[PDB]
Amino acid sequence: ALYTLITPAVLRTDTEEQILVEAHGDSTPKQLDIFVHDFPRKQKTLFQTRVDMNPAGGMLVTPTIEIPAKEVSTDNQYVVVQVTGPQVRLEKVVLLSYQSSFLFIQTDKGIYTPGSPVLYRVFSMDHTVIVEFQTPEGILVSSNSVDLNFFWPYNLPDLVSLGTWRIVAKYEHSPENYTAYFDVRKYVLPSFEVRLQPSEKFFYIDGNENFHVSITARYLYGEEVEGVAFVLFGVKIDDAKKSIPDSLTRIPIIDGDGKATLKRDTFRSRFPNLNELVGHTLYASVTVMTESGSDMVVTEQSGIHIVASPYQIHFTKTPKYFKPGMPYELTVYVTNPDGSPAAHVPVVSEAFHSMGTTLSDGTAKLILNIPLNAQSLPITVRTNHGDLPRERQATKSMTAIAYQTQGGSGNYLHVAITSTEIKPGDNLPVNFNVKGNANSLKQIKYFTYLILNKGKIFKVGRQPRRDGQNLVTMNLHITPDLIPSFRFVAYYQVGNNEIVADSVWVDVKDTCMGTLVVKGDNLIQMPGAAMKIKLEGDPGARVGLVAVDKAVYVLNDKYKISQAKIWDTIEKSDFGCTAGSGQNNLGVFEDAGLALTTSTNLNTKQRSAAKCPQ
Amino acid sequence: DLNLDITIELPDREVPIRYRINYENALLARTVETKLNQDITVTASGDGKATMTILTFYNAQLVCNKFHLNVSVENIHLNKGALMLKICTRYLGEVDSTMTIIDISMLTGFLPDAEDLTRLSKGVDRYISRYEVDNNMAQKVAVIIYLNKVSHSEDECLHFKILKHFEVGFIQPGSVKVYSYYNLDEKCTKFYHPDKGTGLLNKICIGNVCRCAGETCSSLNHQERIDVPLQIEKACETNVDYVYKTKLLRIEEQDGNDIYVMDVLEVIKQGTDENPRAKTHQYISQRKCQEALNLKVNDDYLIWGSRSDLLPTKDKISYIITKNTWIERWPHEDECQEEEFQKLCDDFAQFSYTLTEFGCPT
Amino acid sequence: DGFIADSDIISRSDFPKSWLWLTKDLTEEPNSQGISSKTMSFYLRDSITTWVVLAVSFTPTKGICVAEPYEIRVMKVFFIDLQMPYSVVKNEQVEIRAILHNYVNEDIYVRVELLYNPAFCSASTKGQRYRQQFPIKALSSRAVPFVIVPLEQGLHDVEIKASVQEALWSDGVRKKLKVVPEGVQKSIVTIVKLDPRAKGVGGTQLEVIKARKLDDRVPDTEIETKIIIQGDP
Amino acid sequence: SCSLEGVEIKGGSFRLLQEGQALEYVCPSGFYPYPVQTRTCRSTGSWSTLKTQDQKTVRKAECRAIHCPRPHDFENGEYWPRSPYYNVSDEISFHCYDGYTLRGSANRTCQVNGRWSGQTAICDNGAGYCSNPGIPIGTRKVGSQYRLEDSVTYHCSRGLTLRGSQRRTCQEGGSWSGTEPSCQDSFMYDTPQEVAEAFLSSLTETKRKIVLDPSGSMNIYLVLDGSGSIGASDFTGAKKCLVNLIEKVASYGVKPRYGLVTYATYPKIWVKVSEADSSNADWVTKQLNEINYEDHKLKSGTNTKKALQAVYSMMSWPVPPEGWNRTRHVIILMTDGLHNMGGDPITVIDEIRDLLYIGKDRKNPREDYLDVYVFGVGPLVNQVNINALASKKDNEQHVFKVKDMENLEDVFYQMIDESQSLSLCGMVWEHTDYHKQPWQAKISVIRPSCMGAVVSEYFVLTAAHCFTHSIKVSVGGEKRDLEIEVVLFHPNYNINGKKEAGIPEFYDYDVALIKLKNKLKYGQTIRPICLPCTEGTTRALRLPPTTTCQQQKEELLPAQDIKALFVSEEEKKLTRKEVYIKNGDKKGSCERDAQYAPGYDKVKDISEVVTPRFLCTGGVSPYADPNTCRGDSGGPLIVHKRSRFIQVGVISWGVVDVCKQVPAHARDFHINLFQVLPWLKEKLQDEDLGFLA
């Protein structure tokens, strides 16, 4: 009686896409045909299979579809996913993406001299591809289809444009891409490195404190540098740097160490008007010369935010909708001004008399009890750090809105995860909680749930519900497949007519999904020495290697590949746009990155773009 | 749509280069390179448009840009072989240059006088980094003086003694650099040396081609008798290209070099130059070697040398005098009657006779 | 005399900014915990520095893994450190400032020599290397200036060698000096618009670019012409 | 003459030559005299001072270890291992970075002539207009761009000399101008095999043919340094070489016109291309046999330029003759490169290139019309100078320096042998594996592996202890295993002869002949090896038809330590192993190690198990010898002489089974074929081998 089709709200070409087809209130076995056609003309059948839906399977099927990029090329593209069978005809138009997976470029260095080869690899998270080089002026100078097994070095000419070059890797027809950068400069490697340590990671916009940078200068072979440093402070306003000329200071570097100081008085004389500072950063340019004058290194301490508080409160990890008469889980996210998580910070919502202290991931979950009658929910949170005056505490407000029930039924679903700092290997209790009409609720026999990861449906399941149980608990085993995060979407249906849905966004500890370690003896070596290292990793791993002079990083360290860049890039591409729940049943699917259609014509609205709004 | 056929014909190769430019590859710039400067013929057929840029790179005839700098070094008396180093500098901008640096390297084997350096390091406007002292010498071969500023209106001068730490065969020039915090771009450097007005190593340039002239001087060979077999062997080393008897016609000067103009009187051993007697030969030396070479106009010389020492002088034969060059005074015809030169003359005649008649021995 | 024989001093010369750009396959049998190891042998290059070995792996089910950097620290107790300028100009005298490091906790007497290279005018000659001898205190450094005039355009080795009296310690360094022609590098820029429809005959456009007018040019210096074609959108 | 005070060399010896006006240092194998090998007597009664290449004076001569050049750089790849210096027999291997492809030899071995085996390893991404020229080991390259008209320059570490091209330019045709450079040290030299192959391959096109224009012509100019520096012995050796070269050239059926010039202070022209007889090989050969070293005794300087001007004068014309632009010119120059009169000879080369219009028209460079080959002769060769005169052509060699004159002669002996039929005994042309040992036979007998040598179309010689339809024999490295007809054991053989004396195996007369059922077909991989006291071996050693058996024995097996070799199979690969036969003062101690062999513990006097039939190798004196494996038993013990391979023994038994850290008593024993000649002569009487006695 109720037939439903759920897909990702965006489908990728050339990759396994699970979809979910269900029959509720129907225990008759069926052969279902699954089609995918190009939209709107349906010129061709992009994909086709057939599935068996039977009682033994909960009258639920999860066919995998796959859309070949080569069948649907040429310039937003859509496809229509169609399910047909006895008494069954569902159809859904879905946005297509040409980004079949996530690509990442590794180059051998971040900086090159004229007349030298740029060596690069392209990695894909799931194993074709176009690679392009552009000059600093933005001119395309190389364009090649590459096999992900063999890459062609780009040989820089001797008469070559200086500045920041780009390598771009993309699937053909994809407006998305991965861009990496490298500098081309006339440089020689310095013989030593300069490390900078600010007195604080921030600078109070209206504070009284001075600011210091401690300088450590060490030769790359490990010994201390003696010399002199010239330090100039300034404020970076967007792109332009406005220096504080009277802050220019010359200080001795003795036994590798020195300390430069910006006096508050000097700062104020130059920047008396607080308005000019809001949103901007302090920087310190540090130029170190060895005592003999044989060598010099120029680096900069940047990104010292000029702020009124050491913390920031964010609500980006908490749902903007609540269920009246059910406890609302408020996830508070506190960061430092640079956006790293702030651990061990007390927070409080005074109006609710709720307190918590953030964990290593910077989050604290507070439970707010919500009266049955509330339709709007103003919330204000502030830090409550014992060492700060109230004026330095960070604060932030939001308003959550009540989930609108289908037809005013008053039926709700709330999925609760109490666990924190979740890591692969963990066993996570998931609570299904229902609220509403007694006669409606007795009709509930099961919850359907989907685990969404990196834009896909990763797993679908059924959770039984014995009548009487307004609380039903399930164990979820966390595997490396759920890194860097996942969504838990769930719903029940009543009377083959009403769908009630919820979802939660669950962060997972970011690590490699597998394992890779380089082990050595850690002894100091002589030039030309015989080395042995062990590479430890997963069976069948293909390992790309490189050895880089640490001196290279002294000149440039901004562009290197890393795991955090990998996970961050993936998160920025999430098809779901919110931290959970929704304005109504359809809102829950849409906001989580799912499309829904039903035999009763309950349909999620068309999605604008693959990219979640700013 | 866009559909361009491009043909490039270069003289440096028979097979022209051909591109098609269409919508699909329009963004891609195509480059061709030639090391010549010759006519280029380009053809374009079809629908689209393109921009062709021809870049010709070359070196054109054209540092101490933002500072003036004078350096001199002098002898002084200490009662030692002490020297006095003097440095004057001024900034060429419109205000004083902040955080200026005077960067000094010592002559080989010299170190700063410790008392003078300490005297210099005083003042609320300067800084000189830490140095140990031994035997009244600051243990720094490179000495940096940091100034809070240098004047743009008037020269700022300083001086200090440098003392001999150790001896060497030859003393390399020292140098002084000046730059400042906001002008670390500045290439401003002068050399100094107790025996050279400008601290420059001796070289000899013909246009843009320079040769190292050596810091050591060659000297006229003198021998009261010639061991003829031995002399023959020396003349017959594979690196000895020619052996001549010459007369010195003139001594000319230019760019601190002596040009000894030689007429080749006799080819004793024929070298690479096929007709040396036809053209006059310039033998070039630094004036530092004047005294030691002690050549006299109208005197005759035995000269042999290496082909390596030929200079790229157009329309004259010129050699650099080097340690491979053998020069010896050849007594005049009338001198051959004095008992002073009698037997030496016999030796020269026998040397000449053996070589011209029989050649080298091996 | 009390010093290491020159021929017994093998100069360091291999100073790459990056190397070991290779790929290995974890072909070996997983241990009890699913982990397969691979022992890998190689030799270090010549730099006295810290190397960072970076590994990035991929397996079909585990996606991409970037490993933590592994540092290799390289050192000698006595060595030459030679910072070279990016380039120098032909015929212009310049000073090269080597640093000698004594990381031995005792006073030493050393010999340092600059090798002869016909491409330079220096204190060294074909017959005689420029040699100095001087003390260095325990655990200290000493600047050792060398004055040279580059006589030839291109890349030419500077080589310095040093040893300690009545001890085994020695080091040599050979590094490339980049020598550019005199004068200044200029570019003559000629822009030609290809547009056969508007400029051609029968849809064909023929352009002849004549040899460029130069010869304010330094004699015998190289010339390079780049012909760049860019289609218009 | 010169006093011998303080001439001695640490670690070696010296020998005076040319009656005391020159001395030669002698160093143990694996070593070389530093800084020079030969000194000359000065006028002052003092020996020429010891000078390094940098012309830096050395105070003491000493025998130093041979090392192959260290890599100074290797682009787009890694090599293993990295050492301060590389010892003889050391191996180095190369590996490319990702995205680059390896050309040349991935694995290279350091050889006793100071050279690395194989071809330069290059890691190339094939992006250039031209390929990546590479970095021969020991050189440094400047220039990493490989576009049309780009150049790269090479240099060697001062102390060594650059052979080949110091600069190479990428040409329109896709190749690099000039020829690949290498680094030459004082002790380095070309093997005679390498030179024969390089020269003949350069001169001909491949059987082989000399190539000329349609209706074409060829001029060969033989130019021989007869100055004082050369010496009478090398001069006469150089003559013989030229005589043999004339024969070789004649085999190709072309009729070159010859020029024949010897020179010292002045050139003496013996044959001019303009003479009627100049294309007459027997005439030219006759004149060549006329030349006397005394002819330049009086005026004995070295004016190489003037010699070359005599070649130029033979090429020049009074307008140019019909078909002048059609003739191909080959200059064969033999000199020590120590010219001392007339200046730089290279200027004549340029004049000749001008005359022949070579390298003037880029549309027709005409480089094919001139080849200059230079062979270093004399006691002291100046490499830079001989290289300067020699043609520089891509993938060809035009300049050669061998160890000594005997080796130079071997070059030309091998060339003459190259033409002849396959039945020519003990002859190998070094172009596989059986290509390198075509005499080698594998013998398999099946019972509920030995080696042998082919000695004729019917016969394979092996060891008798290998035996007792069972016996299969394979050659040429073929799956095909041949049927035998009968095995003839030496009649005096008896392995159980001394059984009752407590000696279980007695190896005396341990030789057997296998007669095949069918005749062998000789080919690239199947050839016979020379036997002692035959016509073939008299001819292999270049001796007269009057040479006696005793004279062969004195030549092949002197009472000394004798360099020899055997062939071992290591992993389906044949490989040559260098050993020393202890036939002199070490013979006794080599033999006595027999009493440590298994089974021989009861032996009281080693003459009971080591007889006069045995030759002995192995052990550590004079050098550490490799040992035979069980598989190698029955195989040939070979002496390599005048470019030929002569079997002197059959591998019989060893003291220690070492199939390293091998013990000093590990000797191998072989049956001396000179000791079983009557059986050999008798059994092989009908094989056309031509035995003496």
Ligand SMILES: *[C@@H]1O[C@H](CO)[C@@H](O[C@@H]2O[C@H](CO)[C@@H](O)[C@H](O)[C@H]2NC(C)=O)[C@H](O)[C@H]1NC(C)=O
């Ligand atoms: C060639 O032989 C020498 C030994 O004469 C090897 O010497 C190495 O380097 C020095 C000795 O000069 C030692 O400190 C090393 O320990 C030696 N090698 C070892 C044992 O690791 C030299 O390595 C050899 N070259 C090779 C084998 O490639």
Ligand SMILES: *C1O[C@H](CO)[C@@H](O)[C@H](O)[C@H]1NC(C)=O
């Ligand atoms: C530099 O020039 C000034 C003149 O402007 C002169 O007086 C002074 O002596 C010079 N300084 C030196 C050579 O040290």
Ligand SMILES: *[C@@H]1O[C@H](CO)[C@@H](O)[C@H](O)[C@H]1NC(C)=O
């Ligand atoms: C790659 O993606 C971004 C989108 O703005 C940008 O760098 C650029 O437009 C793209 N590059 C391509 C598609 O070549």
Ligand SMILES: *[C@@H]1O[C@H](CO)[C@@H](O)[C@H](O)[C@H]1NC(C)=O
């Ligand atoms: C190089 O040597 C190794 C063994 O050390 C061998 O496995 C490899 O096949 C060799 N490469 C060749 C012979 O090309």
Ligand SMILES: [K+]
């Ligand atoms: K700074």
Ligand SMILES: [Mg+2]
């Ligand atoms: Mg995470």
Ligand SMILES: [Mg+2]
């Ligand atoms: Mg001679």
